[PDB]
Design a protein around this ligand. Structure first.
Ligand SMILES: *[C@@H]1O[C@H](CO)[C@@H](O)[C@H](O)[C@H]1NC(C)=O
Ligand SMILES: *[C@@H]1O[C@H](CO)[C@@H](O)[C@H](O)[C@H]1NC(C)=O
Ligand SMILES: *[C@@H]1O[C@H](CO)[C@@H](O)[C@H](O)[C@H]1NC(C)=O
Lengths: 100, 276, 10, 278
């Protein structure tokens, strides 16, 4: 039927300062159907203890979810979000950028 | 000022991958306050905002009873939809339901909602009169005929004009300090070169509640709606929201651009510019 | 508080 | 780290039928081993690649299964034990009987007893709604006056509980087999669809069942009778939907019900009763 691929944003809860604890967020939205795999990565490696919000959806019926984990950003560590969905043949990786 | 309550149901068939699943969440404005998941270890309506915990055991009993009944109903509606659409029992399908009420600042009902979808497409919806249906296809026209015979609209209207508004008013008082106090955005503008001849100006709005906001760029006073990149408003994770808008500007023309913000927590609209 | 939906089928 | 084990089309399956076990794990119908001891696999560790197809089903297929999915890059090489799936193989002898108390027409929101009974002294009875994936409900058989019987409660009644039920007796030599299925019992829910009107309507007097609701079918029943008559609803020019049921008619008390096509187990509330004379 009508399958919609997820939009992805990776970002911090608060402005990022190196050495200061924070939350790393991966917001996935606009997708259908609802099954989705989201992991937060540190230098390509899956971070454990990631939580996510309860499945909900927007007025156009597409689904959205927030995945998040506590972390302390450093200069040498690269963070990213990895998302797989029926519409994607391989997971999509979106790097975290301080500016956007 | 104005407020809404909404419930959102998702019922999913997943043959061979799991049991038919029913999940429901409830919101006041942009704040989720309850959840139910048929896949959870102990399925029950459960609190997701601290102010709902002042409801007592009888409340949670009745909410759980409602959710278990709807889970039973929508598991079977998935089977019925398969036959309406001549679809295979091997495929995965989804029903979604939404309903709720909108009230104005005086607390009076402004509109009620009840909509249904199958596989992400409108199926049937209660009209704004709260007494008639709009069916999207021939299958939903069967459903419409059944729901007319069962006077479903009358029961939706009774809820939407009564208990929906009464409970929303109650929650708004129980969680007043978070539900009725707007958190204004914190705003700033960043600059990042894209070459020796162009750069990005990005206007940020952070930590605001509720989620509705207008964030625009102007050039010499006129709005750059065509050349503005807006991200979807996104949750911070702490019940606030974030958004940014960016424009690509020629080198040395930064002073021509201004960012403009309007939000419930901002008593006057805001103008921002970038300076090095 | 949720609505105890009319137990009706599609 | 638990796979999802499932039986298809049904875990309750007759001898000579077919059932397939699949073990969904790591977003695949993975390679798996089956267990019945969760620390030692069956079939000498046979690793099923995609699906165990038991066909034709034999009584040797009856049992309580779990699976573990292949996890090559893991400490133990395998997953935790899945959810269990009990394959119940139904038999060909000693069929019990199934009947509803007070009857198979059940008002929306109310309860009904599905009584499974036999002259055979079954230790247990099982109740299974045709086509559901849940384990058959089990009750001890109670002996009284040369019959063994169990009272299954169904309700509060709504459309998902309506339809065809079977019951079964236990089998003495294994908990995973059942007797031959009872003859089917159809449970019909009445309501919440609005009741029709029933009334005596070159003219001939008929019992007419009518409504402004667009029922497809009307059902006419007489108190103390057994045969329900059914007629298609006809669109009249008044915008009503009506069926006209015709010296051979029994006098007595009648009621009628509307229903929708292909939903034969959901009827409206009953019309008010109508006394028919002569
Ligand atoms: C099947 O086995 C599981 C444990 O593996 C047990 O919990 C369950 O009750 C069993 N079911 C039946 C019907 O024997
Ligand atoms: C089952 O119910 C019937 C009537 O519904 C009653 O006569 C019988 O005694 C009951 N038996 C048990 C074991 O409850
Ligand atoms: C529909 O036609 C019947 C004729 O049998 C009549 O009795 C009935 O009043 C009509 N409906 C209405 C709403 O008048």
């Amino acid at each position: 039927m009508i399958q919609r691929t997820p939009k992805i944003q990776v970002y911090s809860r608060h402005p990022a300062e190196n050495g200061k604890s924070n939350f790393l967020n991966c917001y996935v939205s606009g997708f259908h159907p609802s099954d989705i795999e989201v992991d937060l990565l540190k230098n390509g490696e899956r971070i454990e203890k990631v939580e996510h919000s309860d499945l909900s959806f927007s007025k156009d019926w597409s689904f959205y979810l927030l995945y998040y984990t506590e972390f302390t950003p450093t200069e040498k560590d690269e963070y990213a979000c990895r998302v797989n969905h029926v519409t994607l043949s391989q997971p999509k990786i979106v790097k975290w950028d301080r500016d956007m | 000022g104005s407020h809404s309550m909404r419930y959102f149901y998702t019922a999913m068939s997943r043959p061979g991958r799991g049991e038919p699943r029913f999940i429901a969440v409830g919101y006041v404005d942009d704040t989720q306050f309850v959840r139910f998941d048929s896949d959870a270890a102990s399925p029950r309506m459960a609190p997701r905002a601290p102010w709902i915990e002042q409801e007592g055991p009888e409340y949670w009993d009745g909410e759980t009873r409602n959710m278990k009944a709807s889970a039973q109903t929508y598991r079977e509606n998935l089977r019925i939809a398969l036959r309406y659409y001549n679809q295979s029992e091997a495929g995965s399908h989804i029903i979604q339901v939404m309903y709720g009420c909108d009230v104005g600042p005086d607390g009076r009902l402004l509109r009620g909602h009840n909509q249904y979808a199958y596989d992400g497409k409108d199926y049937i919806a209660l009209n704004e009169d709260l007494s008639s249906w709009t069916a999207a296809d021939t299958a939903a026209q069967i459903t419409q005929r059944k729901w007319e015979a069962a006077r479903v609209a009358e029961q939706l209207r009774a809820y939407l004009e009564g208990l929906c508004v009464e409970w929303l008013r109650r929650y708004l008082e129980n969680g007043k300090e978070t539900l009725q106090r707007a958190d204004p955005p914190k705003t700033h503008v960043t600059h990042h070169p894209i070459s020796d001849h162009e750069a990005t100006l990005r206007c940020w709005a952070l930590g605001f509640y509720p989620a509705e906001i207008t964030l625009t760029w102007q050039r010499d006073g006129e709005d750059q709606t065509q050349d503005t990149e807006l991200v979807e408003t996104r949750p911070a994770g702490d019940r606030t929201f974030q958004k940014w808008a960016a424009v690509v500007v020629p080198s040395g023309e930064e002073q021509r651009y201004t960012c403009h913000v309007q939000h419930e927590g901002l008593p006057k609209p805001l103008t921002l510019r970038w300076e090095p | 508080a949720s609505l105890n939906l009319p137990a009706v089928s599609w | 780290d638990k796979p999802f084990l499932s039986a298809w089309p049904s875990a309750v399956v007759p001898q000579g039928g077919h059932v397939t076990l699949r073990c969904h794990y790591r977003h695949r119908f993975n390679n798996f081993m089956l267990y019945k001891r969760i620390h030692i696999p069956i079939f000498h560790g046979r690793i099923f690649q995609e699906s165990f197809n038991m066909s034709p089903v034999t009584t040797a297929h009856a049992g309580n299964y779990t699976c573990r999915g292949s996890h090559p890059h893991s400490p133990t090489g395998w997953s935790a034990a899945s959810n269990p799936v009990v394959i119940m193989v139904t038999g060909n002898h000693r069929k019990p009987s199934l009947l509803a108390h007070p009857g198979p027409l059940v008002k929306s929101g109310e309860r009904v007893i599905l009584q499974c009974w036999s002259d055979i002294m079954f230790e247990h009875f099982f109740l299974h709604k045709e086509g559901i994936s849940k384990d058959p409900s089990r009750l001890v058989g109670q002996i009284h006056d040369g019959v063994s019987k169990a009272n299954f409660s169904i309700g509060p009644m709504m459309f998902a509980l309506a339809g065809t039920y079977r019951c079964y007796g236990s089998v003495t030599h294994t908990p995973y087999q059942l007797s031959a299925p009872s003859d089917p019992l159809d449970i019909v829910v009445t309501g919440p669809y609005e009741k029709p009107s029933l009334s005596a309507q070159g003219e001939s007097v008929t019992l007419s069942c009518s409504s402004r609701s667009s029922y497809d079918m009307y059902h006419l029943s007489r108190e103390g009778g057994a045969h329900e008559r059914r007629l298609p609803a006809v669109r009249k020019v008044n915008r009503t939907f009506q069926a006209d049921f015709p010296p051979a008619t029994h006098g007595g008390t009648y009621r009628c019900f509307g229903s929708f096509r292909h939903s034969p187990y959901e009827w409206s509330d009953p019309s008010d009763p109508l006394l028919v004379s002569v």
